[PDB]
Coordinates of C-alpha atoms in Angstrom, one line a residue:
Chain A
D3 CA -1.7 10.0 -22.3
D4 CA -2.9 12.4 -19.6
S5 CA 0.4 14.5 -19.5
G6 CA 0.4 15.2 -23.2
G7 CA 3.4 13.0 -24.1
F8 CA 3.9 11.0 -27.3
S9 CA 6.2 8.2 -28.4
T10 CA 6.5 5.6 -31.2
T11 CA 8.0 3.0 -28.9
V12 CA 6.5 0.9 -26.1
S13 CA 7.1 1.6 -22.4
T14 CA 7.0 -1.4 -20.2
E15 CA 7.1 -2.0 -16.4
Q16 CA 10.6 -2.6 -15.0
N17 CA 11.4 -4.8 -12.0
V18 CA 8.0 -6.0 -11.0
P19 CA 7.8 -7.1 -7.3
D20 CA 7.4 -10.8 -6.4
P21 CA 7.9 -12.6 -9.7
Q22 CA 8.3 -16.1 -8.3
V23 CA 7.5 -18.1 -5.2
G24 CA 10.7 -19.2 -3.4
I25 CA 9.6 -22.8 -2.8
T26 CA 10.2 -25.7 -5.1
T27 CA 6.9 -26.7 -6.6
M28 CA 4.9 -27.0 -9.9
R29 CA 2.7 -24.2 -11.1
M40 CA 8.3 -33.0 -18.6
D41 CA 11.2 -30.6 -19.0
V42 CA 12.1 -26.9 -18.5
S43 CA 14.3 -26.7 -21.7
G44 CA 14.1 -29.1 -24.5
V45 CA 14.5 -29.9 -28.2
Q46 CA 13.9 -26.3 -29.3
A47 CA 17.0 -24.1 -29.7
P48 CA 17.5 -21.7 -26.8
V49 CA 16.9 -18.2 -28.1
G50 CA 17.1 -16.7 -24.6
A51 CA 20.9 -17.3 -24.3
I52 CA 21.8 -14.2 -26.3
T53 CA 20.1 -10.9 -25.4
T54 CA 20.6 -7.2 -25.0
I55 CA 20.6 -5.9 -21.4
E56 CA 20.3 -2.2 -22.3
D57 CA 16.7 -2.8 -23.5
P58 CA 14.2 -3.3 -20.6
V59 CA 11.8 -5.1 -22.9
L60 CA 14.4 -7.7 -24.0
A61 CA 15.7 -8.1 -20.5
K62 CA 12.5 -9.7 -19.3
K63 CA 13.1 -12.7 -21.5
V64 CA 13.3 -16.0 -19.6
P65 CA 16.9 -17.3 -19.6
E66 CA 17.9 -20.8 -20.8
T67 CA 21.1 -22.2 -22.3
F68 CA 21.2 -25.9 -21.5
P69 CA 18.6 -28.8 -21.5
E70 CA 17.2 -29.2 -18.1
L71 CA 14.1 -30.7 -16.4
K72 CA 11.8 -29.8 -13.5
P73 CA 13.3 -29.6 -10.0
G74 CA 10.3 -31.3 -8.4
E75 CA 8.8 -30.3 -5.0
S76 CA 10.4 -29.4 -1.7
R77 CA 10.0 -31.4 1.5
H78 CA 9.1 -28.7 4.1
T79 CA 5.8 -26.9 4.2
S80 CA 6.7 -23.3 5.0
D81 CA 8.3 -20.7 2.7
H82 CA 11.3 -19.2 4.4
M83 CA 11.8 -16.6 1.6
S84 CA 8.8 -14.5 2.7
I85 CA 9.2 -11.3 4.8
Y86 CA 6.3 -12.0 7.1
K87 CA 7.8 -15.4 8.1
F88 CA 11.5 -14.4 8.1
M89 CA 10.9 -11.2 10.1
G90 CA 8.2 -12.8 12.2
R91 CA 11.1 -14.1 14.2
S92 CA 11.9 -11.6 16.8
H93 CA 15.4 -10.0 16.5
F94 CA 17.6 -8.2 18.9
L95 CA 17.1 -4.4 19.5
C96 CA 18.9 -3.1 22.6
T97 CA 20.1 -3.9 26.1
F98 CA 20.8 -1.7 29.2
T99 CA 21.3 -1.9 32.9
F100 CA 20.1 0.1 35.9
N101 CA 22.3 1.4 38.7
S102 CA 20.2 3.3 41.2
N103 CA 16.7 3.9 42.6
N104 CA 13.7 5.6 41.0
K105 CA 15.4 6.1 37.7
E106 CA 14.0 6.4 34.2
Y107 CA 15.5 5.2 30.9
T108 CA 14.5 6.3 27.4
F109 CA 15.3 4.8 24.0
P110 CA 13.8 5.5 20.5
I111 CA 13.2 3.0 17.7
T112 CA 15.2 4.9 15.0
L113 CA 15.3 3.3 11.5
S114 CA 18.1 5.6 10.5
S115 CA 21.4 4.1 9.2
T116 CA 23.3 7.1 10.4
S117 CA 22.8 6.1 14.1
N118 CA 25.4 3.5 14.7
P119 CA 24.9 0.9 17.5
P120 CA 24.7 0.7 20.6
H121 CA 22.7 3.9 19.9
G122 CA 20.9 2.5 16.9
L123 CA 19.7 -0.6 15.1
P124 CA 21.9 -3.6 15.6
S125 CA 22.9 -6.5 13.3
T126 CA 19.8 -7.9 11.7
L127 CA 17.4 -5.0 12.1
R128 CA 19.9 -2.6 10.6
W129 CA 20.2 -4.9 7.5
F130 CA 16.4 -5.2 7.0
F131 CA 15.2 -1.6 7.4
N132 CA 17.7 -0.4 4.7
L133 CA 16.4 -2.8 2.0
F134 CA 13.4 -0.7 1.3
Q135 CA 12.4 3.0 1.3
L136 CA 9.1 3.3 3.2
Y137 CA 7.7 1.6 6.3
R138 CA 4.1 1.9 7.4
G139 CA 2.4 -0.1 10.2
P140 CA 2.6 -1.3 13.8
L141 CA 5.5 -3.2 15.2
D142 CA 5.7 -5.8 18.0
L143 CA 8.0 -5.3 21.0
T144 CA 9.0 -8.0 23.6
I145 CA 11.1 -7.0 26.6
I146 CA 12.9 -9.5 28.8
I147 CA 13.9 -8.8 32.5
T148 CA 17.1 -10.3 33.8
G149 CA 18.4 -9.7 37.3
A150 CA 16.8 -8.5 40.5
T151 CA 13.5 -9.5 42.0
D152 CA 10.7 -7.5 43.8
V153 CA 11.1 -4.6 41.4
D154 CA 8.1 -2.7 40.3
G155 CA 8.4 -1.1 36.8
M156 CA 6.3 0.9 34.4
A157 CA 6.7 1.3 30.6
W158 CA 4.8 3.6 28.2
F159 CA 4.9 4.7 24.6
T160 CA 5.3 8.3 23.3
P161 CA 4.7 9.2 19.7
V162 CA 7.2 11.5 17.9
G163 CA 6.6 15.2 18.3
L164 CA 5.6 15.2 22.0
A165 CA 7.5 16.0 25.2
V166 CA 9.6 13.3 26.7
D167 CA 12.8 12.9 28.6
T168 CA 16.3 12.7 26.9
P169 CA 16.9 9.6 24.8
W170 CA 19.6 7.0 25.6
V171 CA 20.2 8.7 29.1
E172 CA 19.3 7.1 32.5
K173 CA 18.2 9.9 34.9
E174 CA 15.4 11.1 37.1
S175 CA 12.1 11.6 35.4
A176 CA 10.9 15.2 34.8
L177 CA 7.4 14.1 33.9
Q178 CA 4.4 13.7 36.2
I179 CA 2.3 10.6 36.8
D180 CA -0.7 12.3 35.2
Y181 CA 1.3 12.6 31.9
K182 CA 2.7 9.1 31.9
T183 CA -0.5 7.2 32.5
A184 CA -2.5 9.3 30.0
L185 CA -0.4 7.9 27.1
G186 CA -1.2 4.3 28.1
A187 CA 1.2 2.3 30.3
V188 CA 1.7 -1.2 31.6
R189 CA 2.6 -2.1 35.1
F190 CA 4.7 -5.2 35.9
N191 CA 6.7 -6.8 38.7
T192 CA 10.0 -8.6 38.1
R193 CA 9.2 -11.5 40.4
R194 CA 6.1 -12.7 38.5
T195 CA 6.6 -12.3 34.8
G196 CA 10.1 -11.6 33.5
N197 CA 8.7 -10.8 30.0
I198 CA 6.2 -8.4 28.4
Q199 CA 4.9 -8.9 24.8
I200 CA 3.4 -5.6 23.8
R201 CA 2.2 -4.1 20.5
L202 CA 3.4 -0.7 19.4
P203 CA 0.7 1.5 17.6
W204 CA 1.2 3.4 14.4
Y205 CA 0.6 6.9 15.7
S206 CA 2.3 9.4 13.3
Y207 CA 1.3 12.6 11.6
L208 CA 3.1 11.5 8.4
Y209 CA 2.6 8.8 5.8
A210 CA 5.6 6.5 6.4
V211 CA 9.0 6.5 8.0
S212 CA 12.3 5.9 6.2
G213 CA 15.8 4.8 7.1
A214 CA 18.1 6.1 4.4
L215 CA 17.9 9.9 4.9
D216 CA 20.3 12.7 5.8
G217 CA 20.0 16.3 7.0
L218 CA 17.0 17.5 8.9
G219 CA 14.9 14.8 7.3
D220 CA 17.0 12.2 9.2
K221 CA 16.0 13.7 12.6
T222 CA 12.3 14.0 11.6
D223 CA 11.2 11.2 9.3
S224 CA 13.2 8.3 10.7
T225 CA 11.8 7.8 14.2
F226 CA 8.2 6.7 14.5
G227 CA 7.9 6.0 18.3
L228 CA 9.7 6.0 21.5
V229 CA 9.6 3.5 24.4
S230 CA 10.7 4.5 28.0
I231 CA 10.8 2.5 31.2
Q232 CA 10.8 3.6 34.8
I233 CA 11.6 1.3 37.8
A234 CA 10.8 1.5 41.5
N235 CA 11.6 -0.6 44.6
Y236 CA 15.1 -1.3 43.3
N237 CA 17.2 -2.2 45.2
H238 CA 18.7 -4.1 48.1
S239 CA 22.4 -4.3 48.8
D240 CA 24.2 -5.9 45.7
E241 CA 22.2 -7.1 42.7
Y242 CA 22.1 -6.0 39.0
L243 CA 19.1 -5.4 36.8
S244 CA 19.2 -5.8 33.0
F245 CA 16.6 -5.3 30.3
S246 CA 16.8 -6.5 26.7
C247 CA 14.4 -5.5 23.9
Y248 CA 13.4 -7.5 20.8
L249 CA 11.4 -6.4 17.7
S250 CA 9.1 -8.5 15.6
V251 CA 6.9 -7.5 12.6
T252 CA 3.1 -7.9 12.2
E253 CA 0.6 -8.6 9.5
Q254 CA -0.7 -5.1 9.6
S255 CA 2.6 -3.6 8.5
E256 CA 3.6 -2.7 4.9
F257 CA 6.8 -2.3 2.9
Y258 CA 7.4 -0.1 -0.1
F259 CA 9.9 0.6 -2.9
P260 CA 12.9 -1.9 -2.7
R261 CA 16.3 -0.4 -2.4
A262 CA 20.0 -1.3 -2.8
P263 CA 21.2 -3.2 0.3
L264 CA 23.9 -2.0 2.7
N265 CA 27.5 -2.7 1.9
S266 CA 29.8 -4.9 3.9
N267 CA 31.2 -2.0 6.0
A268 CA 27.9 -0.7 7.2
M269 CA 26.7 -4.0 8.6
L270 CA 27.6 -3.6 12.2
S271 CA 26.5 -5.2 15.5
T272 CA 26.8 -4.9 19.2
Chain B
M1 CA -1.7 -7.5 17.2
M2 CA -3.3 -10.2 19.4
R3 CA -5.9 -9.3 22.0
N4 CA -6.1 -12.3 24.4
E5 CA -6.0 -11.4 28.1
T6 CA -7.6 -13.0 31.2
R7 CA -7.8 -11.9 34.8
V8 CA -6.2 -14.2 37.4
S9 CA -8.9 -14.8 39.9
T10 CA -8.8 -16.0 43.6
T11 CA -7.7 -19.4 44.9
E12 CA -4.5 -19.4 42.8
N13 CA -2.8 -22.8 42.8
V14 CA -4.9 -24.5 45.5
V15 CA -5.3 -28.3 45.8
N16 CA -8.9 -29.4 46.3
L17 CA -8.8 -33.0 47.6
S18 CA -12.6 -33.4 48.0
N19 CA -13.9 -34.6 44.6
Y20 CA -12.8 -36.2 41.3
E21 CA -13.5 -33.0 39.3
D22 CA -10.6 -31.3 41.1
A23 CA -8.4 -34.3 41.9
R24 CA -8.1 -35.6 38.3
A25 CA -4.7 -35.4 36.8
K26 CA -3.5 -32.7 34.4
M27 CA -0.7 -34.7 32.7
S28 CA 0.4 -38.4 32.4
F29 CA 3.4 -40.6 32.6
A30 CA 2.0 -42.8 29.8
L31 CA 3.3 -42.7 26.3
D32 CA 1.0 -41.2 23.6
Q33 CA -1.6 -40.3 26.4
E34 CA -3.1 -43.7 25.9
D35 CA -6.1 -45.4 27.3
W36 CA -6.9 -48.9 28.5
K37 CA -9.7 -51.3 27.4
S38 CA -11.8 -53.6 29.5
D39 CA -10.7 -57.2 30.1
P40 CA -13.0 -59.3 32.2
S41 CA -11.2 -62.5 31.4
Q42 CA -9.5 -63.8 34.6
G43 CA -12.0 -62.1 37.0
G44 CA -15.0 -64.2 36.1
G45 CA -17.2 -61.3 35.0
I46 CA -17.8 -60.3 38.7
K47 CA -17.2 -56.6 38.5
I48 CA -18.0 -54.2 41.4
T49 CA -19.4 -50.7 40.8
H50 CA -21.4 -50.0 43.9
Chain C
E5 CA 14.1 -21.0 -36.7
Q6 CA 13.9 -18.5 -33.8
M7 CA 14.0 -14.7 -34.1
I8 CA 16.3 -12.8 -31.7
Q9 CA 14.8 -9.4 -31.1
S10 CA 17.0 -6.4 -30.7
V11 CA 16.7 -2.8 -29.4
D12 CA 14.9 -0.3 -31.5
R13 CA 17.0 2.4 -33.2
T14 CA 14.6 5.2 -34.2
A15 CA 12.0 6.7 -31.9
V16 CA 10.2 10.0 -31.2
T17 CA 9.5 11.1 -27.6
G18 CA 8.5 14.2 -25.8
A19 CA 5.7 16.2 -24.3
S20 CA 3.7 18.1 -26.9
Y21 CA 6.3 20.7 -27.8
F22 CA 9.7 19.2 -27.3
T23 CA 10.5 16.7 -30.1
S24 CA 13.5 14.4 -29.7
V25 CA 14.6 12.3 -32.7
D26 CA 17.0 9.6 -31.6
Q27 CA 19.2 7.4 -33.8
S28 CA 19.9 5.1 -30.9
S29 CA 16.8 4.5 -28.7
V30 CA 15.7 2.2 -26.0
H31 CA 12.4 1.4 -24.2
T32 CA 11.3 3.3 -21.1
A33 CA 11.9 1.8 -17.7
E34 CA 9.0 2.5 -15.3
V35 CA 8.5 1.3 -11.8
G36 CA 5.2 1.5 -9.9
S37 CA 2.1 3.4 -11.1
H38 CA 0.0 6.4 -10.2
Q39 CA -1.7 6.0 -6.8
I40 CA -4.7 7.8 -5.3
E41 CA -4.8 9.1 -1.7
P42 CA -7.4 7.5 0.5
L43 CA -6.5 9.9 3.2
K44 CA -5.8 13.2 1.4
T45 CA -3.3 15.7 2.6
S46 CA -5.1 18.6 0.8
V47 CA -8.8 18.8 0.4
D48 CA -9.0 21.7 -2.1
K49 CA -9.1 21.2 -5.8
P50 CA -5.7 21.1 -7.4
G51 CA -4.2 24.1 -9.3
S52 CA -4.9 24.8 -12.9
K53 CA -5.3 27.7 -15.2
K54 CA -8.9 28.4 -14.0
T55 CA -8.1 28.8 -10.3
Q56 CA -4.9 30.9 -10.9
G57 CA -5.8 33.1 -13.8
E58 CA -9.6 33.6 -13.4
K59 CA -9.6 35.0 -9.9
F60 CA -10.2 38.5 -8.5
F61 CA -7.2 40.7 -7.8
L62 CA -7.1 44.1 -6.2
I63 CA -5.7 46.5 -8.8
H64 CA -6.3 50.0 -7.4
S65 CA -7.4 51.9 -4.3
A66 CA -8.6 55.5 -4.5
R67 CA -10.5 57.8 -2.2
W68 CA -13.5 60.1 -3.0
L69 CA -13.5 63.4 -1.2
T70 CA -15.8 66.3 -0.7
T71 CA -13.4 68.6 -2.5
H72 CA -13.5 66.9 -5.9
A73 CA -15.8 69.0 -8.1
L74 CA -18.2 67.7 -10.8
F75 CA -16.8 65.5 -13.5
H76 CA -13.5 65.2 -11.6
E77 CA -11.7 61.9 -12.5
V78 CA -11.2 59.8 -9.3
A79 CA -9.5 56.9 -11.0
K80 CA -8.0 56.6 -14.5
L81 CA -6.4 53.2 -14.9
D82 CA -5.2 50.8 -17.5
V83 CA -6.7 47.4 -16.5
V84 CA -4.5 45.0 -18.4
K85 CA -1.1 46.7 -17.5
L86 CA -1.9 46.6 -13.8
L87 CA -2.7 42.8 -13.9
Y88 CA 0.8 42.3 -15.5
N89 CA 2.7 42.7 -12.3
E90 CA 4.8 40.2 -10.2
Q91 CA 2.7 40.5 -7.1
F92 CA -0.3 38.7 -8.7
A93 CA -0.6 35.0 -9.4
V94 CA -1.6 35.5 -13.1
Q95 CA 1.9 36.7 -13.8
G96 CA 3.3 33.2 -13.7
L97 CA 1.1 32.4 -16.7
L98 CA 1.7 35.7 -18.6
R99 CA 5.5 36.0 -18.0
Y100 CA 6.2 33.0 -20.3
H101 CA 3.5 33.3 -23.0
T102 CA 3.6 35.9 -25.7
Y103 CA 0.0 36.6 -26.9
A104 CA -3.4 36.4 -25.2
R105 CA -7.1 36.9 -25.8
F106 CA -9.3 37.4 -22.8
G107 CA -12.5 38.9 -21.3
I108 CA -12.5 41.3 -18.2
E109 CA -14.7 41.2 -15.1
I110 CA -14.7 44.4 -13.0
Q111 CA -16.1 45.0 -9.5
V112 CA -16.0 48.4 -8.0
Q113 CA -16.8 48.9 -4.2
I114 CA -17.3 52.0 -2.1
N115 CA -18.6 52.5 1.5
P116 CA -20.5 55.6 2.5
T117 CA -22.2 56.4 5.8
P118 CA -25.9 57.1 5.2
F119 CA -25.4 60.8 6.2
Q120 CA -23.5 61.3 2.9
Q121 CA -24.9 62.0 -0.5
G122 CA -23.5 61.9 -4.0
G123 CA -22.9 59.7 -7.0
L124 CA -20.2 58.2 -9.3
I125 CA -20.0 56.6 -12.7
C126 CA -17.7 53.7 -13.6
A127 CA -17.4 53.2 -17.4
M128 CA -15.3 50.7 -19.4
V129 CA -13.9 52.7 -22.3
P130 CA -11.9 50.6 -24.9
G131 CA -8.5 52.0 -26.0
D132 CA -8.7 55.7 -25.3
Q133 CA -10.7 58.3 -23.4
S134 CA -10.8 60.3 -26.6
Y135 CA -12.6 63.6 -27.5
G136 CA -16.0 62.0 -26.8
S137 CA -18.6 63.6 -24.4
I138 CA -18.4 63.1 -20.6
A139 CA -22.2 63.4 -20.4
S140 CA -22.5 60.4 -22.7
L141 CA -20.6 57.9 -20.6
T142 CA -23.7 55.8 -20.2
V143 CA -23.2 54.5 -23.7
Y144 CA -20.3 52.3 -22.6
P145 CA -20.7 49.3 -20.3
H146 CA -21.0 51.3 -17.1
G147 CA -22.4 51.3 -13.6
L148 CA -23.9 53.9 -11.3
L149 CA -22.9 54.2 -7.7
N150 CA -25.4 56.1 -5.6
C151 CA -24.8 56.6 -1.8
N152 CA -28.5 55.9 -1.1
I153 CA -29.1 52.8 -3.2
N154 CA -26.0 50.6 -3.6
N155 CA -22.3 50.3 -3.1
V156 CA -21.2 47.5 -5.5
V157 CA -21.3 47.5 -9.3
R158 CA -20.0 44.8 -11.6
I159 CA -19.3 44.8 -15.3
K160 CA -18.5 42.0 -17.8
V161 CA -17.0 42.8 -21.2
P162 CA -15.7 40.7 -24.1
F163 CA -12.4 41.2 -26.1
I164 CA -12.5 44.3 -28.2
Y165 CA -9.3 45.1 -30.1
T166 CA -8.0 45.9 -33.6
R167 CA -5.7 42.8 -33.7
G168 CA -6.2 39.2 -33.0
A169 CA -4.4 39.1 -29.6
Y170 CA -2.5 41.3 -27.1
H171 CA 1.3 41.5 -26.7
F172 CA 2.3 42.0 -23.1
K173 CA 6.1 42.7 -23.6
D174 CA 5.5 45.4 -26.3
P175 CA 1.9 46.5 -26.5
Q176 CA 0.4 48.8 -29.2
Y177 CA -2.2 50.5 -27.1
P178 CA -4.2 49.6 -24.0
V179 CA -7.2 47.3 -24.6
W180 CA -9.5 48.6 -21.9
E181 CA -9.4 51.8 -19.8
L182 CA -11.5 52.2 -16.7
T183 CA -12.5 55.8 -15.7
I184 CA -14.4 56.8 -12.5
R185 CA -15.9 60.3 -12.8
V186 CA -17.7 62.3 -10.1
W187 CA -21.3 62.2 -11.2
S188 CA -22.7 64.2 -8.3
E189 CA -20.7 65.9 -5.6
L190 CA -20.1 64.5 -2.2
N191 CA -21.9 66.6 0.5
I192 CA -21.7 66.2 4.3
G193 CA -22.9 67.9 7.4
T194 CA -21.0 69.0 10.5
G195 CA -18.9 66.2 11.9
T196 CA -19.5 63.6 9.2
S197 CA -16.5 62.0 7.6
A198 CA -15.3 64.1 4.5
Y199 CA -14.2 61.0 2.6
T200 CA -15.1 57.5 1.4
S201 CA -12.8 54.7 0.3
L202 CA -12.9 53.1 -3.1
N203 CA -11.5 49.7 -4.4
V204 CA -11.4 48.1 -7.9
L205 CA -11.3 44.4 -8.4
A206 CA -10.4 42.8 -11.7
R207 CA -10.0 39.3 -13.2
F208 CA -9.7 37.6 -16.6
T209 CA -12.4 35.5 -18.2
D210 CA -12.0 32.9 -21.0
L211 CA -8.2 33.3 -21.0
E212 CA -6.4 31.9 -24.1
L213 CA -2.6 31.8 -24.1
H214 CA -0.4 31.3 -27.2
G215 CA 3.3 31.0 -27.9
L216 CA 5.5 30.3 -24.9
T217 CA 8.7 32.1 -25.1
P218 CA 12.1 32.2 -23.2
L219 CA 12.7 35.9 -23.3
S220 CA 10.8 38.2 -21.0
Chain D
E5 CA 3.8 3.1 -30.7
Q6 CA 4.5 4.8 -34.0
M7 CA 6.9 3.6 -36.7
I8 CA 9.3 6.0 -38.3
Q9 CA 10.0 4.9 -41.8
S10 CA 13.5 5.3 -43.3
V11 CA 15.0 5.2 -46.8
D12 CA 15.6 1.9 -48.5
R13 CA 19.2 0.6 -48.7
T14 CA 19.1 -2.1 -51.4
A15 CA 17.5 -1.7 -54.8
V16 CA 17.9 -2.9 -58.4
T17 CA 17.2 -0.5 -61.3
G18 CA 18.0 -0.3 -65.0
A19 CA 16.6 -0.8 -68.5
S20 CA 16.7 -4.5 -69.5
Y21 CA 20.5 -4.9 -69.9
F22 CA 22.2 -2.5 -67.4
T23 CA 21.8 -3.8 -63.9
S24 CA 22.8 -1.5 -61.0
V25 CA 23.0 -3.0 -57.5
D26 CA 23.0 -0.2 -54.9
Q27 CA 23.9 -0.4 -51.2
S28 CA 22.5 3.1 -50.6
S29 CA 19.3 3.7 -52.6
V30 CA 16.5 6.2 -52.7
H31 CA 13.1 6.4 -54.4
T32 CA 12.7 8.1 -57.8
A33 CA 11.6 11.7 -58.1
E34 CA 9.3 12.2 -61.1
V35 CA 7.5 15.3 -62.1
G36 CA 4.6 15.3 -64.6
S37 CA 3.6 12.4 -66.8
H38 CA 3.5 11.4 -70.5
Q39 CA 1.2 13.7 -72.6
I40 CA -0.3 13.1 -76.0
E41 CA -0.4 15.7 -78.8
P42 CA -3.9 16.8 -79.8
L43 CA -2.3 18.9 -82.6
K44 CA 0.6 16.7 -83.8
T45 CA 3.8 18.1 -85.2
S46 CA 4.5 14.9 -87.2
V47 CA 1.8 12.8 -88.9
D48 CA 3.8 9.8 -89.9
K49 CA 4.2 6.7 -87.8
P50 CA 7.2 7.0 -85.4
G51 CA 10.5 5.2 -86.1
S52 CA 11.0 1.6 -85.2
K53 CA 13.0 -1.5 -86.4
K54 CA 10.3 -2.2 -89.0
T55 CA 10.4 1.2 -90.8
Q56 CA 14.2 1.5 -90.7

C-alpha cells in the first residue's frame, strides 16, 4: 500500500461497468444437476454479492434475430433527440440559448424529456456534441448562427432582442450562413472548447451556474419579413464517438422527468 | 464529427440533350434495376450496328 | 456438497497509527481506481515534508549603523523559537508533533555601498552566549562580512544538544543562538548613507518528527 | 489479508476416566517442567501397585 494502510481482509472492486453484452448470444444448460449454491447469499458483503445467481434448472436462451445492439449508449443516443423550439416575430433580431445540462433548469428553459433523463444518469460529460437545426416557416430569409464557449461575452440567454455585438466579433468565433429557401436544415458539430475537465448536470449553488453549461448557440436572422408569415426553428442533439461518459449515478425520480 | 463538403459549381440542373453521356437515365421504372439479354431468334441474325 | 461462504467477523484496518478491531466486519467496496493526468493542472512537484519544512524563511531584519561601537551586538536571536511561529509553513508540521531532531542552515545578507567600510561576524553559538571571550568567536561555525569583499555568508551545522530531541511546547534551553557582533566599525564620508540593512534566512535540514499529539 | 486467531470453543480434557466437554475452552497455562533430583531425598523405589 502507498498510503500506509493495513488490513487482514480483502478489498474487491464494486459495481464494475459493463458486465454483460445486452444481446442474446453465446460467449447445454445454464443450471443443471449440481445443487444451486447461489440461491442463498449475504448482500451486506460486496465479495459474496458478486456471486452468479441461480435457483432453478434452465438452459441457454439461444441467439437473437436482429444484428444491432439497442442497449449501447452510442447507438441509443446516436438517435437525435429534441432540444428546443422558438419563433421569431420581427426584423433583424437575435436569439440566444445555452445547452445547459443542469437539472435545476426546468423546460422550456432547459433540457426536455429524453435529454433531461440521459444527462442525469452519470456524473461527468466530456466531448463534442452534434446539433441539427430545422427551419419551418418563411422563405427568402438569410440567417447566421455561431458558437460561443462559456466564459466569453455574449447576449442574454433565452431572450430575443437586437444584437449588441459587432460583425467582427461574430464571424471571428466561426459562423455558418444559410438561406431558408435552399436548405431548411443544418447539421453542425459543436466543439469541446472549455477551460475545465468535464461538465456535470447534478449540481447546486455557484457550481450549478459555472460547471453545467459547456457551450452556447445563438442565431441571428435578416430579410424577415413580408406581410404575414411565421418563422420557427427547432433544435435537436445527437452524440458522437469522440464523447465520453463517467461515473454512473442514480436516475431521476418520476416527478423530475418533465417535458415540453 | 464528419467532414464531407462539396462546392456546388455552375450549370446547376441543366439538361444536355447532345450526347448519351449526358442523356442517359439516372433511375429506372424496372424492378430490381434489371438488365436484358440478347435474343437473335426471330430476327434471323441480321443485326444493324452501323 | 457445496460450501456457502459468509461474511468475515474479525478484521483489523487502519492507516499506520489508528487500529480498529471489529467483531462484525465486511469487505471494502471500491469503485474506480487511481488515474494519472495526461494534461496536468499543476506542473510543480506535489507537496511533501521536504518542500514545506526544508525551505528558507526570513526570521529577522536588523540594521547596522555608524553609531554602533566595537563589539556591539547587532542581532541576538534564538533560531528555533523564531521558526516556531504561525506565519511560516513549517508550523503545520511542528504544531502537531512533539519532538524533533534537525540541522540548521543559516544565510546572512547585507548591502553596503562601496563608499562604506567596516566588518561583522556571524557566529553560531549552541545553547548560551556564556562567559567566553568575544575575541574568540572564530572558534564557532562563523562567517566574516567585509564591506569590500563579500555580502553573503552561509553556515551549516548539525544537531548539538544534551538530550535526544527538542520539545517545542516546553523547551529546556535554546539549541542554537545566533549572534552578530560589530567586528570593525562602520565609517562613511559626507553624504554617504549612515546605515546598511541586514537580513537573516534560516531553514531546517534532515528534519525528523516524532510523536504526533492532539494538545498544542 | 491477515488472519486474526481466536480462542478455541470445543475441547475434551481429563485423565483417562473423567471426561469434560466444554463449550467455552482455552489453552492450558503451564510454567516450568518436570525436574530430576541430582541429590535425592529418598533412595528407595517409588510407590506403585507392585510394592503396596
